[PDB]
Design a protein around this ligand. Structure first.
Ligand SMILES: C[C@]12CCCN1CC1=NNC(=O)c3cc(F)cc4[nH]c2c1c34
Length: 351
């Protein structure tokens, strides 16, 4: 029986992100019907059909259709993406937050299809499965020293930018990995100014796909009204805002946080949401949803050519009527993103 040749730290990481049984438990909590559509029978085409159904719902909403048209549009979606609501009728989809909820379900399902394809790509016996899964990611994950300057700034970044409204939990940095996805260095825009180290969170089910395919842009079939600032890659400067998207629980209190170098260039700053913000760029390179509270430049430091927006965060007075509490950074080409650090985090829930 071939033993693992990977670092014990990387071994634990792959086990976490390749746990298909944990993936089935997560999708059921999202009301997805795994009995009716098993995860091992997921296909790219089925997920794309779900996106197009949501786009059809957005067409009903734009046309003011809240009757049979909307019900039949939602029925088609729930038939392609089956849910488990008991004996109840499936809820209708209408609002942006309800659209986004389904978009996030589809994004998890898409990355889950990548994960099953990967674990099924194991040639059993050849070597330990963990080493096989790791190589098939085609993404380097190098564990770093806890007395390294990297670990010091990133631990500071994690604690200093924890938002006061997200007071239901704290976060303990368990481990830190340097990330090198094949090709990101060669496509990155080292020319663009305002290179910043920004957070991004996601459910545990999505990290095989993220580390295998990079942060991606929403597909053309998706309705644009589900993305507050358009079909781009979203980042935060407040760790807890991204860490909320890990969707950790008291029993599943381990999550992953990604730090990436983002070439924002000149930002197009918006006071409120607009799903069509990409057309408002006008030679600018990124959209910045202005938040009321943000880190101040008086605490910033540099870590390997990028600016770390360390806390403590102060208020900006932004009060345009739901304004953003905290910032949001959106780039619309993946060549502005380079994944760099992966954080294994313990969530400390405060009851
Ligand atoms: C709901 C949404 C819209 C596009 C993908 N979705 C998932 C997401 N995941 N993760 C983050 O760390 C994040 C950080 C932000 F500052 C804003 C964000 N908006 C999103 C995310 C997000």
């Amino acid at each position: 029986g071939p033993e693992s040749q990977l670092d014990l730290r990387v071994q634990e990481l792959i086990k976490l992100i390749c746990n298909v049984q944990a993936m089935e438990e997560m999708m059921m909590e999202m009301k997805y019907n795994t009995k009716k559509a098993p995860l091992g029978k997921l296909t790219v085409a089925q997920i794309k059909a779900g996106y197009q159904s949501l786009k059809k719902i957005e067409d009903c909403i734009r046309a003011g259709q809240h009757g049979r048209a909307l019900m039949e549009a939602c029925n088609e979606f729930y038939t392609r993406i089956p849910h488990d609501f008991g004996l109840r009728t499936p809820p209708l989809i209408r609002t942006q937050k309800e659209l986004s909820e389904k978009i996030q379900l589809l994004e998890a399902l898409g990355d889950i299809e990548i994960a099953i394809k990967l674990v099924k790509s194991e040639r059993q016996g050849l070597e330990h499965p963990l080493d096989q899964h790791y190589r098939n990611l085609h993404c380097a994950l190098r564990p770093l020293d806890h007395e390294s300057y990297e670990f010091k700034v990133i631990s500071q970044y994690l604690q200093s930018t924890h938002a006061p409204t997200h007071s239901d939990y704290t976060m303990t940095l368990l481990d830190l990995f340097e990330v090198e996805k094949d090709g990101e260095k060669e496509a990155f825009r080292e020319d663009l100014h305002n290179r910043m180290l920004l957070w991004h969170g996601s459910r545990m089910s999505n990290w095989v796909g993220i580390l295998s395919h990079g942060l991606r842009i929403a597909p053309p079939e998706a309705p644009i009204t589900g993305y507050m600032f358009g079909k781009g890659i979203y980042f935060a400067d407040m760790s807890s805002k991204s860490a909320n998207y890990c969707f950790a629980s008291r029993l599943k209190n381990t999550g992953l946080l990604l730090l990436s170098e983002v070439a924002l260039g000149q930002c197009n700053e918006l006071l409120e949401a607009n799903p069509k913000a990409e057309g408002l760029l006008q030679g600018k390179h990124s959209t910045k949803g202005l938040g009321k509270m943000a880190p101040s430049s008086a605490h910033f430091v540099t870590l390997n050519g990028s600016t770390v927006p360390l806390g403590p965060a102060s208020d900006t007075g932004i009060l345009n009527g739901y304004t953003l509490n905290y910032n949001e950074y959106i780039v619309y080409n993946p060549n502005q993103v380079r994944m760099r650090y992966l954080l294994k985090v313990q969530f400390n829930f405060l009851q």
